[PDB]
Symmetry: C4
Subunit: 232 residues, 4 copies
């Protein structure tokens, strides 16, 4: 009840099988798209999209029995749990979404192939130092988004009407996307002093983002210099 | 036994009361945004904002005397002073733009929590060693911002008519926000040779603004 | 004649004569443009094409006789071979295909000046350090390009709704090239929550590059750091 | 006489006096950029601009004696030399692109202050390290321009009609500025694979620059 079973899941090619599947469903989806394919090999992809979805469901619950408590202390598996089950809901005969969220099972190659789980994590190994800056921002935008809704708002509702709309347009200014001619000019042509709001908003906004690439090498590589190198 | 006040202003508890009042009034403004809200429930919100503003002109006048060797020489609280100052309807023979300025308060969630006060010291950490090459380029702006008006002001007033008008453009060109067909493909019509002014200038601003990035990291 | 062809080749004169016979094909190529030149005296350069081209495709024999097996194994060598062979094409008649690609022959300068290849290499060296985050990116993109045809390519045929046309548009969205007004405000009107596919897809695709160049700086500065620590 | 007034030049007194003037003249140059001030009042200080250059052009005669063959072998000193010559332009020339060069005399603010001086030296400190790579692409940019006139400029002459046209468009592409929607997608409505020349060009140009800025701690 364990042993015959423990050995199977852990195999060499069963991974290379559910990796051989992950890599397969992903190619029908690329054909599922162009309905020139789908009207010449429809039921194929459709029902291959149901037969594939089950090996992933035994695979998950097999892994669940083998590991038990530790399966549910693995984000890679919880995310596996997350992803694979999101497809378990009957997305067919339903809302657009979960049909198009079921494709998040190609996030599973990431889960599936090893070294893709270090560099993914070498990237998730960055947010702890940044959750300090990340929150300064979120308030800098709560406070300047509002000052926006008020001054513009009626005149320019599509952009800065309701606060979220100020959020959407603040973000857009930030990446500096067509902001020059698109959003500030058109404002400056009825409220001409609106450049007092946005120019030095832009300064705060790229100074900050630059000053966290001066610090991701000084503040994230300061914890990598205190406990790992002095080991000598 | 005198001066018993200075033993409540300083603690670890006063912060979640001011801080957590900041956070409240640092939300009430947000719900003002829903147009509907401030119809059904405006009544509680008009006063809510006022209750803190005196409580804050309390807190601050009650922070005024406890700290004095370094209070006015504390820009955080001077920033807490002037921010709170504007909130009480100044009377200076002036007109109504200030109503929007008060929300600047809810920056007080950074003013009086150290995690959001560690980081704002790491912002102005190396604002010197930078501020010269701010002040250089601010000449390089200014100068090109001269020829610019002095070279394309008769045929292009909207973009570069005056000194100021020329500036607001070069900053875009710098942030590069549709510079080519937004601004230079056109001038190139009345004036065919206007590329030299920007292909160069585009480098200089960005070459500067880039070296500024690598010349700070080692520090 | 093996020792006597090895004297013509790899001699101080081969510089005096190949690097020169290149640069004056890249002066003369700046003149097969602005066609007033072609009508007038263009047959000089239509066949100056051919001097340069047989001057080179003799070298394509000279080098292969001399460095008989040490050529096909040189990185910086198979290019010129390819760059000449691929230029070794019919001068005019046909559909017209690799008539344009000839101008790669100007690349030969990189391959016959050592100052070039070091810089090429100080650039290409950083590749493989990433060549698996490169496909971290293709995997992520693939999931997303699909999630576009099955999302917006009902009403926006130009920007999505196909496996092909969606990869692009997202690419323009990555560089943030007229992204918001230009492409996302439109989709949002048809579907407001389109942001819930791009406000994220941004913060991610940007993120990864920020931590896959921050790699590129630390990758070159963690090698400097090791030979200057065991002895100084 | 030829050794005497070295005492007036090599002095703490000399530099600031000119600096003071070129801050006046720099206040009153940015002021010469004016629709009203030039007309209303500038005709009465259009003399300032010419009695400044007189004092200027006298400065650049004895400095020349102080360093006999060493004036024109100093970087910053050759600069303001040629810079004043352009500024010496007769109140009526041929093509008054030179009356608008006049502002380049305000660049004497960088070559006369040793802070502003050697930061330029710190700037051009990375350029002869970079020369190693700039050329590598003014050959990348130059050939990707060649290949656009024989694909694209008989259906997009405005953009890739000639070399030049392709230089500008290409430079534009690399500033990533409105390139898909603005220039690239339109191309796909006649020649469909325009993107397969355009995307990796993006990557190849995009590759180098980032790799430049990394190993710029070395050059
Ligand atoms: C204090 C230093 C900040 C300098 C800002 C840099 C350029 C920003 C650009 O927004 O300038 C706008 C101003 O020059 C506008 O002034 P005008 O409205 O043209 O008034 C004349
Ligand atoms: C690694 C590179 C991935 C990021 C950029 C991808 C660029 C590809 C984009 O242009 O679209 C992909 C192609 O399939 C487009 O094909 P179509 O225009 O639909 O067909 C013509
Ligand atoms: C930077 C890399 C190369 C720098 C030198 C050339 C850059 C200038 C570019 O904008 O091209 C302009 C030249 O082609 C002038 O030609 P046009 O006036 O556009 O003639 C058509
Ligand atoms: C693979 O193709 C790509 C992918 C990403 C880029 C980014 S786009 C970007 C996104 C966010 C912040 C800045 C940028 N910029 C802005 C500067 N540009 C306007 C000159 C970039 O150039 C690219 O990243 C870098 C440091 O060069 C370029 C090509
Ligand atoms: C269900 C409504 O929530 C949203 O769509 C938004 C969220 C709630 O979801 C958060 C998802 N990031 N956070 C912010 C910050 C958003 C914003 O304004 O720009 C992203 C929006 C929003 C608010 C009002 C109008 C439009 C929109 Cl999109
Ligand atoms: O074949 P197309 O041209 O419809 O492009 C998308 C397809 O799904 C590719 O398999
Ligand atoms: O920006 P200017 O050139 O319009 O100068 C503003 C002054 O107040 C006018 O004298
Ligand atoms: O030369 P002009 O007389 O056309 O004046 C404008 C400049 O030359 C181009 O910026
Ligand atoms: O089909 P909808 O109405 O769920 O819209 C799609 C979402 O807004 C994201 O594209
Ligand atoms: O699509 P074609 O074959 O007509 O050639 C034109 C361009 O080179 C495509 O990029
Ligand atoms: Ca744009
Ligand atoms: Ca843009
Ligand atoms: Ca841009």
């Amino acid at each position: 009840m364990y042993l015959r079973i423990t050995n199977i899941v852990e195999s060499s090619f069963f991974t290379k099988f559910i990796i051989y599947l992950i890599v397969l469903n992903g190619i029908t989806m690329g054909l599922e798209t162009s309905k020139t394919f789908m009207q010449s090999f429809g039921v194929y992809t459709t029902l291959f999209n149901q037969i594939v979805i089950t090996i992933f469901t035994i695979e998950i619950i097999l892994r669940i029995y083998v590991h038990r408590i530790s399966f549910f202390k693995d984000p890679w598996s919880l995310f596996d749990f997350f992803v694979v089950a999101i497809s378990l809901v009957p997305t067919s005969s339903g809302f657009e979404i979960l049909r198009v969220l079921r494709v998040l099972r190609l996030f599973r190659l990431v889960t599936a192939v090893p070294q893709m789980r270090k560099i993914v994590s070498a990237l998730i190994s960055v947010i702890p130092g940044m959750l300090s800056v990340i929150a300064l921002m979120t308030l800098f935008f709560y406070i300047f988004a509002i000052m926006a809704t008020q001054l513009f708002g009626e005149r320019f509702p599509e952009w800065f009407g309701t606060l979220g709309e100020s959020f959407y347009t603040l973000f857009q200014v930030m990446t500096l996307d067509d902001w020059s001619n698109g959003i500030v000019r058109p404002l400056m042509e009825v409220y001409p002093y609106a450049y007092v709001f946005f120019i030095p908003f832009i300064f705060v906004v790229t100074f900050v983002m630059i000053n966290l690439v001066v610090a991701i090498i000084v503040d994230a590589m300061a914890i990598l210099n205190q406990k790992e190198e002095q080991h000598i």
